[model samples]
Target: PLQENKDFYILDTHTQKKISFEDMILELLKADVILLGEKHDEVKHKISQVMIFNALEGNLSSQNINFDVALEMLASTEQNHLDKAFKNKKTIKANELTNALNWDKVWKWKDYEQFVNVVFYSKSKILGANLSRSEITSIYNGAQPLKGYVSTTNEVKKQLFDIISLSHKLNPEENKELLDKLVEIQQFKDRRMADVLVHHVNKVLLLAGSYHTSKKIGIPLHIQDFKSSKKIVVVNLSYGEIDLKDSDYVLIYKG
Candidate 1:
C-alpha cells in the first residue's frame, strides 16, 4: 500500500547526485572527522546511525585504524562515567549504563538506545563532547564571554539569530539582547565539541544535532579554526532535503 514512498535517499552535495548507502559509507571512511547530524526524535535516523556505526566499525577494524565515537548527549563532565561504563559494558545492561552516566532527561534514552548499544560494545573509544550543565549555566549567567581560538562570523550569527528566534518564538528585532546571548551560547557549545574532536588524532564520528554539525556555522568551523587541514564530512539525516552548503551530504529519511 505504501510502495510509492522510498525508504531513504543519500545525496552527495558536491556532485549533486544521489548515491547508494554503501557508497556513502565509502566516502565517509575517507574523512578524518565525520559529523553525523541527526534529528533527535526521528526513529529512522537512529536506526541509520546504528547501521553506519557498525559498518564503519567493521571497515576501520579491518585496517586497524583507531576510531572513536563522540556523543552530544553526554557531557564532558561525564567522561569518567563513560570510561567506567565502557570498561564494564559487557556486564552492564542498557538501563544501568544510563544510570551510571546520570543521563539527562532532555535526550530520551529510549530514542538513542539502539545506536548507543552498538557503540557501547564496540572497540572504539567513546567520548563525551558536550559542555556540562555547570559550564552551560556559567555561560548563560555571563561568565566573562566564552574564549576560543575562532570567532563567529556575522553571517553565521545572522543564521543563528533566525534559528534561535524561530525556536524561542521571539521577535528578533525586539529581543536583540536576549537573542545575542543565545547565539553566543550556541557557538560556545560548538567550540567545546570542536575542541574535543580536534584533540583526538584518530578518526572520529561525532553524533550530534544537525545545527551543531553545520559546515559553515557549527563545529566544523571551529575545527577548521583549530586545525586547517582536517578533512571533515558533514552528513545530515534530515526529514527533507537540505542545501549542500549546509552539509557535505544529505541523507533524507522517511517515516
Candidate 2:
C-alpha cells in the first residue's frame, strides 16, 4: 500500500478514556515484540510516551511483558554492554547514561521511567537502538552499512559530524581513531532486530525515535527477521495534538 497520507495519523487522545497507553501492558505481555514509533520533541509525542510506559507498567506486572526495550538514540552494541552492567547490578550517574534515560517527571518520559526504575530496572532490559557513540562517529564521518540514519547531505552530515566531533574534541585525526569501534556499534541500535530479535517471539517491546516511524525509515518496517510475521502486531503511534500548554491538562496528566 502507498503511504502518502501518513502525516495525518496520530494516537487519538480524545478516543482514550480511563485507560490509555498504560492499558497496553497486557498487549505487551502476550507479544514477542512491541514496536513503538514516535515523533521527537512534540509535546503530543511526550504524552504518548507517557501512555506507552503506562501500558508497559500495567502489562509488566501482570505477565512480565517487557524483556528488552531498545531506543533509537543508542545502539544495540551499547545496549549489550549496558544490559550486562545492568544485570551485574551496576549503576551509573545519570550523565553516564543516554540523554533519553534522563527524562523524569522533570522531563517528558519521566513518569514511565519512574515505573521502570522502581519496577523493571532491576528486572527487565533497557537498550539503545541507534549506532554506538563510536559508530555514530563513522556515520558522521560518512561510513558504510549505514545509509539513512547516519545522515543525508553535506550540511546535515556536517551537523552530524559536529555532534561527535565535539564529543571527542577531535582535531580530525582523533575523529578517525573512533571509527572502528563506533562502526562496530550497531547502527542506531537497530542491529539487534537486524540480526536476531525475531527469535524472542514471546514478550518484547521496542522503543524507538519518531524519525524511525515514517515506514520509509521505520524500525519495525525495516525488521524482516521475525519469528512470527503473522503474530507480530505493530502499533504505530504518537501523542495526539491537544492542549499541550494547558496548565490544567499538563498538570493533571494521568487522571
Candidate 3:
C-alpha cells in the first residue's frame, strides 16, 4: 500500500517552470474558466483540489467577484433538485444539496464534502456540469452518428482506442468497446461539459477527472471551440506517466 505522505510541484506547462501556489491562483483569476482536474481517490490531489478552490474563493471575494462552481461529478439533470434543495434560502443546511443530488449513491460524498462545504459556506452558485445518465445512454446505445455536429474526430477516435487498449490490459470493464458499440462517450461527455460551462456568466471553476480536462483533446479544447475568445486554464494532478503536456498546468506529485 502507498504511504500517506505526498508533495506536489506546480508546473507552468507553457514555460516548463515551477510556479508558486499564488501564481496558480492568479492564473485562475485571469481565466474565464478554470479546470481543476483530479485522479479521484488520490489523497493529496483531493486535498489540493479544495485548497486551490478555497484560495480562488478568497481571492475572488476580495475583489467582490462572483465565484461560480461547476461539477463534472454531478449531472446537469439535477439542477432543479439542487435549486429545490436550497430553495434560495439565506442559510442552507450543509448536507441538503448533496442529499438532493444523490451524492452518496454515485460517489462517496465525504471525499468531496470539502468542496461542497466551501461552496455552500461561501453562498456561491454551483452547477451540475455533466450529461445525465439518459443522455449518456442515448449516445452509448444509438447506432447513428450525432446530428449536425462533428461527433467524432481522428484525435478523439485515437484517444478512445488508446483508452480502450489501456483498459484491456488493466480495467477491462471500463472500456465500453466490449459492450457492442463504438460510442465515443468520453467525447460526448466533453462536449456536454463544455456546454454546461458556457452557461456560467461569471468566472467559473470546474472540477472534472484529469482526462476530461486534457488540453490536447478534452473538455478544454471543446470549450475553446465553443467560445474562442474566452481565456481558459486546465490544471491536473499529474503522476509521472500522465503526460504533463496534456494540461496547461500540472501539480506533479513526488514522494
Candidate 4:
C-alpha cells in the first residue's frame, strides 16, 4: 500500500490521445483558475494530482502567480478556524490544521494530506468551498429558503429555474418538487464554491467532484457569471469513461 514509482497518463480532451506533462505545462501556467475535477477515489489519481500541484508550484510560482488551494471537502463554516491556523503556516503542522478543521470524521484526511502539505509548505491560502451539512440540508428540506440568500443579482433564481426545468426533463417520472429541492442543493454547493473563487484574487486550483466541475452544468457555469473574463481550466481525472466533452482537459488514467 506504499505509494511509490506509480504513474498515469493524461489525454487532452480534444485529441483523445495520450499527452505528456510538458504539453499541459503551458495551459496550466496561463490559467487564472485551474478547476481540477476528481472522483476522489483511486490512489493513482491522487498521485497524478500531486504531480499537478508540483507543476503549479514550479511553473506558476516562478512566474509570480501566487497559488491558493481550495477544497470541496472542507466546509465554509470553519473558515475562521482554517484562517487562524493558516495565519502562521510555518507553526501549524498538518495534524494541527486537520484537528482545527475537524478533518477526521468527515473524510479520509490521510489520502489528502499530501496535497495539503503542498499548500502548507508553500504557505499558500487554503480555502474551504463547501457549505456546512446543516446549511445544505436546511435548504434541501426548505427549512432555509433561498430567498434569504440574497445576492448581488437575480441570476441565482434564473439559474435555479432553468436547471430545475432541465432536471424535470431528465427525470420525468420523479417528484417535481423534491427534484427541485435536490437540484437546489447542487446549486447551493456550486454557488458557495463560486463565491469562494470570486472572493479570492489568487490563482486557485480547486479540488472538487467530477459533476461539480462539468462545463455544461457545473460550478464552472456559476463561476462564468462571477468572473466571465478570467481563464478557468477544468481538468477531470477519468477513472472509467473516455469522454472529454465535459472538461477542458481529461486525464484518462490507464489503470
- Return the top candidate by TM-score: 1
Candidate 3 segments exceeding 4 Å error: 1-6, 86-91, 147-151, 168-183
Give the range of the ten consecutive residues with the poorest summed lDDT in model 3.
143-152
TM-score attained by model 1: 0.92
Q: Which of 1 and 2 is ahead in TM-score?
A: 1
lDDT, candidate 2, 84-142, per-residue tens? 55665445444344343432232355424433343234455665445445655556575
Candidate 3 per-residue lDDT, tens place, 128-189, comes to 88988887778777646533233356666577666656755534467546432443677778
Count clashing residue pairs in model 1: 0
Each candidate's lDDT (Cα)? 0.84, 0.44, 0.73, 0.73
For all predicted structures, in order, the TM-scores are 0.92, 0.51, 0.86, 0.80
lDDT head-to-head 2 vs 3, winner: 3
- Shift of residue 177 alpha carbon in model 4, Å: 5.2
Model 2 local distance difference test score: 0.44
lDDT of 1 by residue, 120-228 (tens): 7788878999998888878878867555454478878889989899989999899998998899889989988999888877899999999999886799889878865
Q: Candidate 4's residue-wise lDDT over 1-255, tens digit each?
A: 222223455677876766677677677878878888877766766776788888778776687768888889988787897887777677867667777556736668877877777766784777888888988878876855433233323454445556566745645355567766776787788878887887778888889887778776577777766655778888987766555767878776434
State the TM-score for model 2: 0.51
Clashes of 3: 0
